[PDB]
């Protein structure tokens, strides 16, 4: 509406700018993002189509909005700023002057906002024709200087981020002199502070990967970074390091294909103990990796010693023998496993794109090392539920602040998506005859990834659409094989009926189905442009029974997909996987008659034995049953007749079993069945 309004009737409206803005100011101050976006569109077209005076009033108003501000408003306003500059920079340049005077006010702004702000200002600044007004450049250099020159990390981060971001922008050799001097100063300032050096490395690394420009200034720095890495941490491989540790320190978790009597080992426990540099090791290696990949074009012939390298660690062993001594050493152990996990995650980030099979095998050995140390770490965190190492990620969490589930996502180094190219390797089932735990790790990661993203710095700079697009390739037609091997495993697990392999494969199945649910319940499939990718996915899932049906009708693809998917209900060993399978089938069949399949399948899950292990029946917890029964009773053809069925089977719970003729129906679970029953009766 507003689009066509300002596109057709501009000649009318131009006369009445004042009114538009006395509106737009009133719109943003309220809540409700749709309101505020409407105000955005007002400002945008107002600046787009009118005259100069209006343009000036726009920018002035936006300045006001930012500065006086509250968070929503602010953010929107900054987005608008970005829009204005990218739309018409030439016009914005002559009103840049008022834009600059914001910098007098920074007391209010959050580092994310700051990132955008400096982006805007610098992007405006290094237009080639307005070096006449390099004024803004000097003032920004000034304010950078003042913030960096502060003890207070709150200011330190601001200066760091501003400076690095500015540097990225000017690199589309005086520019080289500026960037070098800048970054050297930043490096020197951050050298003091561990949570600041980390931010420098991490923010610089991601910023460098994003900009992908000024490689010369990058060929300059990489010669410094490779040397500082290989002198800072890399030591001769002496199994005993210097330092009085109450811990047998060895060169543990080596790959052992390398020479054990080698040079390059990595000092970890003496560094973290002498601190109490090692906190920066993961991001610093990330930076080195990115710089050498930009220089040598993915050639890692210098580093592959680092994928093979053993790590100078204490025995990080299941310390049930070291129980009931909580002290600065338990934080040491939890943080040490934390750090080595971050290190290994950064390695698998590094060497996943490389296609040499020995390196892939090395990555898989690192993956099994990772999952082993993950189970050891979550156990150590189960030992003491208060020893948290506060080391978050830096885009949002570090400015936000300044147990096992926190670390798995937010604390650990976040993996790439190309890391799920590893799940290509085939399952080798250890019971029946890429292992089960090295796939469990990737699937448990991928679940938390897509739930976080679709419903986290490195991921969140990518759009949802491209993320689901690439997951569609790196899950479905490669995880189908693992799904089918799992079907063949659990078919025999059903036929026979030791515990841990069945429990892990059950959790792998549960996670696989949760991944499918998160994949297909993506709310970007309501938009009409994205249905082709779903259309390809269901073509693949239909092609898992019979091939030849290409360019099928939609309901035919649904029928074939659900006909493939339903028959796993006999192979499901626990309840969470059943709930996720039925909801998956719902959200794939929501595109369409279909009521009957879900109703049929939920009854099958309610009729099933569900073997009454204690943890197994804990997975049939009350809220899960409530959700499933609400699904069943709502989706059935007739709700009242289903309630009469349940009140024809709910009464013999007293007479026979002191466990019924319709199991998962006890006196405990009767409460939830009763509640959902009367609730759906009301509905």
């Amino acid at each position: 509406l507003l689009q066509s309004t300002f596109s057709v009737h501009y000649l009318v409206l131009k006369d009445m700018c004042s009114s538009i803005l006395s509106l737009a100011q009133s719109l943003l101050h309220s809540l409700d993002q749709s309101i505020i976006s409407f105000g955005s569109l007002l400002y945008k077209y107002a600046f787009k189509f009118f005259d100069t005076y209006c343009q000036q009033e726009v920018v002035g108003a936006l300045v006001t909005h930012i500065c006086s501000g509250n968070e929503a408003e602010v953010d929107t306003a900054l987005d608008v700023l970005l829009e204005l500059v990218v739309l018409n920079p030439s016009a914005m340049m002559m009103n840049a002057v008022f834009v600059k005077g914001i910098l007098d006010y920074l007391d209010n702004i959050s580092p994310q906002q700051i990132r955008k702000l400096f982006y805007v200002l610098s992007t405006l600044a290094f237009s080639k024709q307005n070096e006449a007004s390099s004024h803004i450049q000097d003032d920004m250099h000034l304010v950078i200087r003042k913030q960096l020159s502060s003890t207070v990390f709150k200011y330190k981060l601001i200066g760091i981020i501003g400076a690095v971001t500015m540097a990225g922008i000017m690199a589309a050799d005086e520019q080289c002199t500026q960037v070098t001097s800048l970054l050297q100063l930043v490096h020197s300032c951050s050298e003091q502070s561990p949570q600041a050096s980390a931010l420098y490395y991490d923010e610089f690394a991601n910023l460098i990967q994003h900009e992908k420009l000024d490689p010369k200034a990058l060929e300059w720095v990489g010669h410094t970074i490779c040397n500082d890495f290989q002198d800072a941490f890399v030591v001769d491989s002496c199994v005993v390091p210097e330092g009085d540790f109450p811990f047998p320190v060895k060169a543990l978790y080596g790959l052992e294909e390398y020479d054990t009597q080698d040079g390059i080992a990595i000092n970890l426990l003496p560094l973290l103990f002498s601190q109490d540099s090692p906190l920066c090791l993961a991001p610093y290696f990330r930076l080195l990796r990115l710089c050498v990949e930009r220089q040598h074009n993915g050639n890692l012939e210098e580093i592959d010693g680092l994928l093979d390298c053993p790590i100078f660690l204490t025995d990080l062993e299941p310390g049930e023998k070291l129980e009931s001594m909580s002290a600065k050493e338990r934080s040491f152990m939890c943080s040490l496993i934390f750090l080595t996990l971050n290190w290994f995650r950064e390695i698998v980030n590094a060497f996943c794109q490389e296609t040499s099979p020995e390196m892939k095998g090395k990555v898989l050995t690192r993956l099994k090392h990772i999952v082993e140390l993950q189970i050891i770490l979550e156990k150590y965190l189960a030992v003491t539920p208060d020893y948290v190492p506060p080391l978050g990620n830096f885009d949002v969490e570090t400015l936000d602040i300044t147990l096992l589930l926190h670390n798995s996502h937010a604390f650990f180094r976040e993996l790439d998506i190309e890391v799920f190219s590893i799940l290509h390797c085939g399952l080798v089932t250890k019971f029946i005859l890429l292992g089960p735990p090295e796939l469990l790790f990737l699937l448990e990661d991928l679940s938390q990834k897509l739930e976080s993203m679709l419903t986290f710095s490195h991921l969140q700079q990518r759009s949802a659409q491209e993320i689901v697009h690439c997951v569609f390739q790196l899950l479905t037609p490669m995880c189908n094989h693992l799904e089918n091997i799992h079907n063949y495993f659990q078919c025999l697990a059903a036929e026979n009926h030791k515990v841990q392999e069945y429990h892990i494969m059950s959790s792998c199945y549960q996670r696989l189905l949760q991944i499918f649910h998160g994949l297909f319940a993506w709310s970007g499939f309501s938009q009409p442009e994205n249905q082709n990718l779903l259309y390809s996915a269901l073509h693949v899932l239909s092609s898992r029974l019979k091939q030849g049906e290409h360019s099928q009708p939609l309901e035919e693809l649904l029928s074939q997909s659900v006909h493939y998917l339903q028959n796993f209900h006999q192979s499901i060993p626990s309840f969470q996987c059943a709930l996720y399978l039925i909801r998956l089938l719902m959200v794939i069949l929501e595109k369409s008659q279909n009521k009957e399949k879900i109703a049929s399948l939920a009854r099958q899950f309610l009729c099933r034995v569900w073997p009454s292990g204690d943890k197994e029946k804990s997975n049939i917890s009350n809220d899960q049953l409530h959700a499933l029964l609400c699904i069943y009773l709502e989706h059935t053809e007739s709700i009242l007749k289903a309630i009469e069925e349940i009140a024809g089977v709910g009464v013999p719970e007293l007479i026979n079993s002191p466990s019924s003729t319709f199991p998962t129906l006890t006196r405990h679970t009767f409460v939830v069945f009763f509640r959902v029953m009367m609730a759906e009766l009301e509905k």
């Binding site: 250099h141 000034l142 020159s149 100063l185 020197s188 300032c189």
Partner: protein, 476 residues
């Protein structure tokens, strides 16, 4: 001489660099002078080498650092370097200025004060070191004796602001204090001095100073700053009026002070309220002598802030009524005329605003028009459809009119908006007595009708309503 220092700096710290640092004992000056003659980046490299090689755990390095501090501070100003190396120098010194005890930084700040007072600091970029030093003194919990570091900071800044500031380097001195963590009293002394300075400056160097004052005022001290700027400009206007008994300069100043105070009040919705409360006439019944041609110019530019529009206008209106009540009571009464000194009346001030308005004051005039029409709308006659209802209403309305005529002589872009607003009140009402509006319109038009063949359409659409109008209205 440098490459050996680079090579000793390349590998390791506090082993070799200290021992080489005890070779070259003297002239850091000649070194940095030839270095800036050749290349500043070599000097930066040397500075990094020395500062890492001379840590501040040991005390020998501290005196070399002090001497190189004095050297670089003087050379960055007196020695005309290139801009970039200047920036790198200052960034470096700022950075390494943390690692120190109190008294060394205290003597550096004393050097800065004693330089900036008398030593003509040729540029003044070195003063950027000053805040960080005081910053360090705020945070240096190594106790001094002369006391806390913050109390030394109190003393030093008090001595700075009480001591003379050069006329050309109050902008820089003030712009430095944007960042220092000031309490109330500190910033009060700051602004006391900065306001003190105005009189001893070129007029064209007042606008930006005020700008920096107000972004500083946002810390503590708003009432003081505004009362100050009011006071100074009121005195200027009075001087100009008594000398007349320059306009282009004085006017462009007042007219950009007001823009800058407006900008700040948009960015700060509290600056305005304190402004108004300080300036509110109706305290009990009393006309205050805070109000002035400038005091009012400012308000009528402020009136274009949405939040204040109502409140400012209503203030002005009530003030103007009060004006006229006062004047009537005085004129009927000699007892009061003997006692009270004849103060200018708000009426007169506004009209005088309008003359000064002429030049370049679009932001005031657009408030003026609104004001005047509020006067007319409110105090047009009603009682036929006496002292109290007639004179301070008649004079209110005809103030409106005087305003809008005077503006219509000189502000040729708010024509067709007087005109259209007049007509807007002409046509439709015919129920409320509208005598005053046609009288106005008559004066307006007679004065220059040639300016209505630039706004003509606005007449011809009231001719389409000429059929529907009562008779006295139409002929007149």
């Amino acid at each position: 001489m440098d490459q050996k220092i680079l090579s000793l700096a390349a590998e390791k710290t506090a082993d070799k660099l200290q021992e080489f640092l005890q070779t070259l004992r003297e002239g850091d000056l000649t070194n940095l002078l030839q270095n800036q003659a050749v290349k500043g980046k070599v000097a930066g490299a040397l500075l990094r080498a020395i500062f890492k090689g001379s840590p501040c755990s040991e005390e020998a390095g501290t005196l070399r650092r002090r001497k190189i501090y004095t050297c670089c501070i003087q050379l960055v100003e007196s020695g005309d370097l290139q801009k970039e190396i200047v920036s790198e120098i200052i960034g470096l010194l700022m950075l390494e200025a943390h690692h120190f005890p109190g008294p060394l930084l205290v003597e550096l700040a004393n050097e800065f004060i004693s330089a900036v007072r008398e030593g003509s600091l040729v540029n003044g970029k070195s003063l950027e070191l000053l805040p960080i030093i005081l910053t360090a003194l705020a945070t240096k919990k190594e106790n001094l004796a002369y006391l806390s570091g913050e109390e030394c900071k109190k003393q030093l800044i008090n001595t700075l602001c009480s001591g003379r500031w050069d006329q050309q380097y109050v902008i820089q001195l003030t712009s430095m204090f944007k960042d220092v963590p000031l309490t109330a009293e500190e910033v009060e002394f700051v602004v006391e001095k900065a306001l003190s300075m105005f009189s001893k400056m070129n007029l064209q160097e007042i606008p930006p100073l005020v700008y920096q004052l107000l972004v500083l005022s946002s810390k503590g001290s708003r009432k003081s700053v505004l009362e100050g700027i009011i006071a100074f400009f009121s005195a200027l206007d009075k001087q100009h009026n008594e000398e007349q008994s320059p306009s282009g300069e004085l006017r462009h100043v007042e007219g950009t002070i007001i823009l800058h105070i407006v900008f700040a009040i948009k960015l700060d919705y509290e600056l305005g309220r304190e402004l108004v409360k300080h300036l509110k006439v109706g305290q009990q019944g009393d006309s205050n002598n805070n109000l002035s041609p400038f005091s009012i110019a400012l308000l009528l530019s402020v009136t274009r802030i949405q939040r204040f529009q109502d409140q400012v206008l209503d203030l002005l209106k009530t003030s103007v009524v009060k004006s006229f009540k006062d004047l009537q009571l005085l004129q009927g009464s000699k007892f009061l005329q003997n006692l009270v000194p004849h103060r200018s009346y708000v009426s007169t001030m506004i009209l005088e605003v309008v003359k000064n308005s002429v030049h370049s004051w679009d932001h005031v005039t657009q408030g003026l028009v609104e004001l005047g029409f509020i006067l007319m709308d409110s105090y047009g006659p009603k009682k036929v459809l006496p002292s109290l209802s007639r004179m301070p209403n008649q004079h209110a309305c005809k103030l409106g009119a005087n305003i809008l005529l005077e503006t219509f002589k000189i502000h040729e872009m708010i024509r067709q908006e007087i005109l259209e607003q007049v007509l807007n009140r002409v046509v439709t009402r015919a129920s409320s007595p509208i005598s005053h509006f046609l009288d106005l319109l008559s004066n307006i038009v007679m004065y220059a009708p040639l300016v209505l063949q630039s706004c003509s359409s606005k007449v011809t659409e009231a001719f389409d309503y000429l059929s529907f109008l009562p008779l006295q209205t139409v002929q007149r």
